[PDB]
Amino acid sequence: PTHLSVDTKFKTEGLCVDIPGIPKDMTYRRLISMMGFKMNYQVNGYPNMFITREEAIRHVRAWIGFDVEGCHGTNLPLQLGFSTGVNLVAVPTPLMYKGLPWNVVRIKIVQMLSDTLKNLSDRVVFVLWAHGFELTSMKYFVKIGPERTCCLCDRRATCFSTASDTYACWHHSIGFDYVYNPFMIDVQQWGFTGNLQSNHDLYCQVHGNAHVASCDAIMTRCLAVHECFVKRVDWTIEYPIIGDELKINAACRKVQHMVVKAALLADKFPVLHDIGNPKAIKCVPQADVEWKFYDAQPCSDKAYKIEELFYSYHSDKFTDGVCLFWNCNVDRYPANSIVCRFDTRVLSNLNLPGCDGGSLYVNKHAFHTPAFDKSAFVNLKQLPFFYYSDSPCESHGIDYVPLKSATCITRCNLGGAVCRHHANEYRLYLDAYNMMISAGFSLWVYKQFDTYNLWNTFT
Ligand SMILES: O=C(NCCc1ccncc1)c1ccccc1F
Ligand SMILES: O=C(NCCc1ccncc1)c1ccccc1F
Ligand SMILES: [Zn+2]
Ligand SMILES: [Zn+2]
Ligand SMILES: [Zn+2]
DSSP states (O other), X not given: OOSOOTTSXXXXXXGTTTSTTOOSSOBHHHHHHHTTOOOTTOOSSOOOSBOOHHHHHHTGGGEEEEEEEEOOOOSSOEEEEETTSEEEEEEOOOEEOOOEEHHHHHHHHHHHHHHHHTTTOSSOEEEEOOOSHHHHTGGGXXXXXXXXXXXXXXXXXXXXXXXXXXXXXXTSOTTOOEEESOEEEEGGGGOOOSOHHHHHTTTOSSSOOOSSHHHHHHHHHHHHHIIIIISSOOSOOOOOOOSSHHHHHHHHHHHHHHHXXXXXXXXXXXXXXXXXXXXXXXXXXXXOSEEEEEEOOOOSSSOBOHHHHHOOOOOSOTTSSXXXXXXXXXXXXXXXXXXXXXXXXXXXXXXXXXXXXXXXXXXXEEEEEOOOOGGGGTTEEEOOOOEEOOSOOOOOOOOOOOOOOTTEESHXXXXXXXXXXXXXXXXXXXXXXXXXXXXXXEEEEETTOOGGGGGGGOO
């Protein structure tokens, strides 16, 4: 049970307004044939154009909401909308393009999908709320066949060119005119009552319905993300490395140890309340502090209410010492906090657009994160960059330019001249810091935090 059987039944009720008379009894095999495609009993890696929910979730990076609305059907112009906000008008002769024939529309589709997906995935998964026109329009821009490799590289082929009779991946498809071996899923097969807008609007207020095909395409993909990542959560599913995943996670671990160690040295809290990850380890193992853990899984729908996390009767007194919220998203942080909050607004290959302002952050696992809210941090301040070290000034073992920095909190800098070891360590740490920030993470600390209190730890 790996792929979706072509002999699986497809409910056609949602298709009968564009396609009147459609048989109630329908398989994927018959539907694909009706869409104008011939599979020829091919055992060559492409068993079905349609995929399961499980296969769709594994390939969330490939998701592109797609909707087709009749502007006037072989005789009428069609408006093709994509969750990228693009609207193309195909004539059979929020970006809105005027009517053009299919031979030019298909070139634009290949360019748009290649630019959106080359750094995300090896495929495209068209996420539909199928009514008919979108399925019958696929023959105009899609070619199918056996699984192939790119003409210029080892990646699988996602595009085809009728000019050169060649196949290309998303990175080498310039000038290509056909989408090759796409995948698709119809959200209406999941069992919903009512139309797209009524189901989407139950969980999201950020996407509106301007009555254009891209609006519906956006709502469709948002609803699919809500069903698969918000109301249902599977953190076991692994996702491939496509960018700076390893460096970001390593930087996150370096920054957490640095910031927590310095906060304990500067304000000598007798107790730390570590709220979040049920699998958390002490990030500063040598610290004197009483380390107490509280379990909370990552919230994917709304941010946790601090009243529910802390009250209803543990040290009980969270007000004593400091609270560490490392990627634990709460509505309003207490004043005595050390916080790392992922900013859902960040533009990156890891962060996909999500539901109701939130974003789907995909790094080893998929985490739908609730919308970033600046008010969550009213009792805190932004944590400034600093590097702290009490390790001995000793090189051991990359050329050098002398480091001068007020934020290099070391015994050598206190003594008036940064040593080579602490300069190399400072520069490596600043790189890890910038990587973590640029990835979308934001750091916040209790208002009394002052790095001036770290200089007296060298006496
Ligand atoms: O937002 C991004 N990617 C679009 C994903 C997407 C869009 C529309 N419909 C489905 C999926 C992005 C932004 C900045 C950098 C890299 C990115 F990948
Ligand atoms: O949930 C995340 N990370 C798994 C460990 C974890 C942390 C905190 N609370 C529970 C669990 C996570 C979510 C969004 C962005 C970055 C992340 F690291
Ligand atoms: Zn290639
Ligand atoms: Zn939405
Ligand atoms: Zn030094």
